[PDB]
Amino acid sequence: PGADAKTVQDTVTQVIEQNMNGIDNLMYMSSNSDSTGTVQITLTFESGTDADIAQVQVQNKLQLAMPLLPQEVQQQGVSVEKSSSSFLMVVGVINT
Amino acid sequence: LGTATGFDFELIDQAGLGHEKLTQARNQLLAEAAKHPDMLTSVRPNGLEDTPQFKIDIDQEKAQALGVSINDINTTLGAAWGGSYVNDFIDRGRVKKVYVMSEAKYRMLPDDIGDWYVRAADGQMVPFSAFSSSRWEYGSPRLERYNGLPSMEILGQAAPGKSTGEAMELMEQLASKLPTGVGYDWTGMSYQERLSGNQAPSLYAISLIVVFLCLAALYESWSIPFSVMLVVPLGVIGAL
Amino acid sequence: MPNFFIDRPIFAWVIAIIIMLAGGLAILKLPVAQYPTIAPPAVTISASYPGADAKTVQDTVTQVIEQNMNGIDNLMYMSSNSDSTGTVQITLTFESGTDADIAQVQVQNKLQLAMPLLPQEVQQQGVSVEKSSSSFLMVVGVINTDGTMTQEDISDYVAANMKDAISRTSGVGDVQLFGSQYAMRIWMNPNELNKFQLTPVDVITAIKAQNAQVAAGQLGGTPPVKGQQLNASIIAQTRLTSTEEFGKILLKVNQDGSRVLLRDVAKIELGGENYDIIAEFNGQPASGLGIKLATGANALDTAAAIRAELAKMEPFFPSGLKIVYPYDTTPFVKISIHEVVKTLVEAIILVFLVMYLFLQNFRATLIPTIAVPVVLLGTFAVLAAFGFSINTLTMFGMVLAIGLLVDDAIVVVENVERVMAEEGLPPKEATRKSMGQIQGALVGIAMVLSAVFVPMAFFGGSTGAIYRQFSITIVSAMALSVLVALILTPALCATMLKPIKGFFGWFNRMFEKSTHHYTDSVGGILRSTGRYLVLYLIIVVGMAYLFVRLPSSFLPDEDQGVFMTMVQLPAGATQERTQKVLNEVTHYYLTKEKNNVESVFAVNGFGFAGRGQNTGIAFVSLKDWADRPGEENKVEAITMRATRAFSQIKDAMVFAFNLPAIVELGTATGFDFELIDQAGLGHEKLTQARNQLLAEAAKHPDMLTSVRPNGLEDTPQFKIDIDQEKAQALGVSINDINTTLGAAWGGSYVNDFIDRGRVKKVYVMSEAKYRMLPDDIGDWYVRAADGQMVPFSAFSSSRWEYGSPRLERYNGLPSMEILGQAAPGKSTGEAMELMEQLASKLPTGVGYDWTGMSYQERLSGNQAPSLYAISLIVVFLCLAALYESWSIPFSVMLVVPLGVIGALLAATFRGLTNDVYFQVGLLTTIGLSAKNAILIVEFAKDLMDKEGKGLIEATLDAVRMRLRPILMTSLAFILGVMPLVISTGAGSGAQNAVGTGVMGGMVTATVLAIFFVPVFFVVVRRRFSRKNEDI
């Protein structure tokens, strides 16, 4: 919260990236760090990779980098999720 | 998947050049690409351009002379203007966050900076103006990295009548004339198209070869298979 | 099928072509490896406690982690080292077949329970959990040929621009930097600090405050006021980027207004995170990456991926920077496999030639020549179906399978060319009835021979995959051979066979006469059978003696074009002395092994046991095998001479050693012992127990040899006692004291900075000159609550003591590893039994265990004899079915010793052992021997059943008929396996070994069979009969 893109990149993104080692079947890695205080790092794996194994291997390397991140980021936490743009539906909730 | 039409290019800082030099190299590539409308169309960055930002320097000597700690200064600035997640409370049985932040009207403009006071060790309240200075500068609102290195993603597509493969060839030729230390890579759909294309010739060959061999066994003849295999264009022409 | 394809030769070709296409596509995609995977997965936890001694590491990190290691599936044992570089390594070794991904997940799930209990300094160094082999796959070296970059510069360039992408590459399980990345080094001066009434605590506090990256929010940020037109990020402090900026950190302002800057109390420079690892390439400054193969990953695919990634970096190198390749285990794999391919081709050509010699017709010879490639290519497709790899044993299966299937088509082609001579049927008509006579026996005999190898496919243990893949390859090839002989061969016999001197005339007539004296000799032997019965038994007793006389091993050492040299100095020795020893090692290879050594990559400060000022390693790469003729230019003799030369180096343990085929199984005669503190005795008592055990072992040179500890000896350490009362009285904080002491003498990782775009570390530490001497301790001052500067001498006392630089634990208890081996002639089992006896007489509370290779030894015992018994039983049963007789099978079984004797003869005279390759050749010999015997019995019995000829007439008519075709196929294969025997170059150790046993077994199985088989048949039928034969 409140961080600029360079602060995010240089205290969070680079640290996490430098720890994404020893993971199997990685094709490439990409990231953005932005002025809303957000970073997203996406690791893309070979077709046929077990997505659960890929995610736990990523999550476990991340876990061991958490002590290197700023306290404010440790407090917010860092989420690791399987990526997917396919929604079954979007339920809207409005007040009339 | 995305549009999966066009190409997906990564410009890469391979030698610690820095954001500004990478931007210059990007612009060089975009300008050259614009000189080949016959081959490339809508070659553009996928990210954001640098914007004005408000650089505030804390004067350490003045802070120390007044007895104001840097931690109080930076917490006061960050908590008021950026907001701060303090801890959690429990709202109707559900754990939720507590945030402190300035009310909107006291964190809008540079003149508001001087309305925020920090208590020194001797109890006196000191305004931010007394130990800071500011200036406008440019910086990035969105920094990109690719395989751990600074990068800028560039999207585009082949011009009408041209194949994406040909457009990729030119992009690579143009990229080879960029300043020292600037590399590139293909990602996404473009990574996908290169690998699928490298397989196609051998898969066609295996299909053609096995079809011939099955027919040769069927007819006990190395030549009669051809009379069947010649039919291929007859359907294809009407589909086209 | 035969009659079907005789009418459809193009269909036959189509099936052969599809078989070959599938095999060809398998060859392009199958994994390539030296051996099948047999090594158990190992997960290693690594952590670092900067400035910590071994006991501090053990008692605040290692024990905490170990106590959380529970509920982990398939765990065989756990071991750990805690050392006075501040490093701990904990290795968990799992059962063969364990999924390394799950083992890593399970280990980490438990580690995360321990992580919060670990010191913050340890957490912030980064704890790592890796799943990799223990040995290096390769070392990637980096030099600067223009000499414009120092060792430190190159190391930082590798760390900052190369290492991470290599570390992310799939199959790379671990990467060691031979060097260090740059950090911002603040080298504190205690005199200047005291002059300004400052301490390392103030320095650290000021760096955290003035090397900061501050989140400051936005102008016009959300939620905004109405009418806002400006939105912009606020940028406050950012990480410092240069020594200049660190130098002007403001520590304080004096009363008179003067400023104290960090550069007034410290020297500030870019320099390594650590200064322990310094490498050279052929004496020149270097860095590099030591790469370990991830568990179960393919070595060749991973090396290829590493090279492709390195190729992406090279264009952006600074001037002069160059990648060198001083140590790579993978070329040997690739080249050794290609050499077996070459001998496979050469074996096929040598078969084609020996047949043209006997057949004397290209057409008649070509049909067999076409069948073998079709079958072998198809066997590759079967390997893919079974999920096997192209490796040494599947490739030896390809070569040795030839001898057991080459007769399939020959029996078909010849039984046709005979039908066209007896009668006058055309080639097509003859093939049909010909196939009707042999088709059934072909299938059935292939099943009898398959019985030889099927049992061995059920071999257990880690060793089991070796015998399994070989057996499957042999059986698959024989099965495909039958199929090809029922599909392609009949079609070619019916389309190509020509309807039915010189050197050949000379050959034919020579053989004609030889056949005459042969049949004559046979008839004479039939009348003197009693004598030759006795001769047979002593062949069986001789075979028995040579079998027990022959020593046994697992896999021969191979010259792999590379090897390593270990440098171990006593703890307490300095970096400077280790470099002196490394210079001597490097000098020796560059001056005394000019003809053999291509490069030396020497690393000061790195060993396999662990880091330290007192340890180093030299990686040595040799010139190509072709440029190193003779055994004196092979790795074994090179390392022997080197170790002998290095024995004259004082105060150091230096030895060159070859890589073992399988590091896991390790030495052929070595053991791996663990002495265990079972009762909280403590390190000093355990050391004494160790010494007692080491002394008693020396008293038995008869059975034990080189029984030594694997770890390090105690060394002097500087014990300093902080006096709590004096510190309280002076108002000196214990936290200030410990931070001042640890930061100055051990170093402290303060926070991060940005060096040319890359996040890196900042370290404070005393400048070297103020942390070299015990007296320097009192030059460090701490500030009390009342502002007075207090020297360490005012509140501390010190004394010398002894302590351990490397504490070992095994399965969670204090331990000491002891290596050793059996004395000449003695067996490892005998040596281990003695060690157990000696261990039982040790002080109360001292226990023991076996690990590593010795865990495998006691675990998997001898299981080959039972499987050989099963094979023989099943072969006999299959023969009983083939001949519908319980007795006739013995006429074939009795030929097995005639072949086994030759394989033992050859292995003995040539000096080989009873290893993997002698056993796969021994099974092949059994099958080849039975095969040759059936090439006689099947015909001798065919006349007594179809031509009604008597026992003695049928026997002598068959041998005369079969002497030529038998010696044809037999000598062809004997010559065919010649390239295995005379093999030199990569993998020649395995080739020579497997060839010697098989060829030796073929020779005896061929010369003795043509004389003894007639005796076996006639004697067996006479005994087990009533009113049938002899007329």
Ligand SMILES: CCCCCCCCCCCCO[C@@H]1O[C@H](CO)[C@@H](O[C@H]2O[C@H](CO)[C@@H](O)[C@H](O)[C@H]2O)[C@H](O)[C@H]1O
């Ligand atoms: C009748 C001729 C034999 C058949 C021809 C060979 C068929 C193809 C064999 C497999 C592919 C080539 O592999 C064959 O073995 C190795 C491959 O490293 C080469 O061997 C050569 O180079 C290697 C290193 O590369 C040296 O260690 C070796 O001393 C030298 O002989 C042979 O020159 C090559 O012919």
Ligand SMILES: CCCCCCCCCCCCO[C@@H]1O[C@H](CO)[C@@H](O[C@H]2O[C@H](CO)[C@@H](O)[C@H](O)[C@H]2O)[C@H](O)[C@H]1O
């Ligand atoms: C019966 C006589 C014939 C017996 C012949 C047996 C030869 C077996 C030797 C193969 C050993 C080397 O195995 C080697 O593996 C690599 C890595 O997959 C293959 O590498 C291949 O990759 C791709 C597909 O994977 C191919 O498009 C490419 O042309 C080739 O480089 C080699 O083409 C193959 O030669």
Ligand SMILES: CCCCCCCCCCCCO[C@@H]1O[C@H](CO)[C@@H](O[C@H]2O[C@H](CO)[C@@H](O)[C@H](O)[C@H]2O)[C@H](O)[C@H]1O
């Ligand atoms: C797991 C349990 C199953 C495993 C069983 C092991 C079976 C092993 C069989 C060994 C081989 C048997 O080999 C078989 O022997 C018989 C003996 O009559 C031969 O002889 C037979 O040939 C054919 C078979 O249809 C008949 O027309 C003929 O009259 C008969 O003599 C066969 O041609 C041969 O194929």
Ligand SMILES: CCCCCCCCCC(=O)OC[C@H](CO)OC(=O)CCCCCCCCC
């Ligand atoms: C004139 C040529 C027409 C080719 C049309 C192919 C369009 C499909 C492309 C595709 O998805 O590729 C899949 C696959 C690759 O092996 O396609 C093919 O294999 C196409 C070739 C099959 C036809 C040859 C047999 C002759 C008929 C008896």
Ligand SMILES: NCc1cccc(-c2ccc3nc(N4CCNCC4)c(Cl)cc3c2)c1
């Ligand atoms: N029973 C009539 C009869 C009359 C005359 C001859 C054969 C004959 C047929 C096929 C044979 N197939 C054999 N092997 C070689 C090794 N591979 C498996 C198969 C061997 Cl050893 C002997 C063989 C005898 C059969």
Ligand SMILES: CCCCCCCCCCCCCC
């Ligand atoms: C791989 C293609 C094989 C084709 C073989 C053609 C048949 C054999 C040659 C013709 C034989 C007739 C001459 C007597």
Ligand SMILES: CCCCCCCCCCCC
């Ligand atoms: C798809 C590959 C087929 C190649 C074989 C051509 C057949 C030869 C024609 C003439 C035979 C009489």
Ligand SMILES: CCCCCCCCCCCC
């Ligand atoms: C446990 C190992 C299984 C053994 C497989 C059976 C061996 C014969 C297979 C032949 C394949 C054609």
Ligand SMILES: CCCCCCCCCCCC
């Ligand atoms: C028509 C028969 C074709 C199958 C040939 C089988 C050869 C023996 C295989 C042994 C399996 C254990």
Ligand SMILES: CCCCCCCCCC
């Ligand atoms: C003789 C061919 C045997 C079947 C080949 C099928 C290929 C299996 C790939 C997994």
Ligand SMILES: CCCCCCCC
């Ligand atoms: C791969 C197809 C080979 C067929 C050629 C036969 C021509 C006589």
Ligand SMILES: CCCCCCCC
């Ligand atoms: C581990 C699976 C083995 C598959 C065997 C296939 C038999 C042809």
Ligand SMILES: CCCCCCCC
């Ligand atoms: C471990 C026992 C295996 C025995 C294999 C038997 C095959 C018929």
Ligand SMILES: CCCCCCCC
């Ligand atoms: C293994 C069983 C053999 C039994 C032979 C019986 C002879 C009549």
Ligand SMILES: CCCCCC
């Ligand atoms: C009747 C024989 C057909 C076999 C095809 C594989």
Ligand SMILES: CCCCCC
């Ligand atoms: C006619 C039987 C076919 C067998 C193929 C494996």
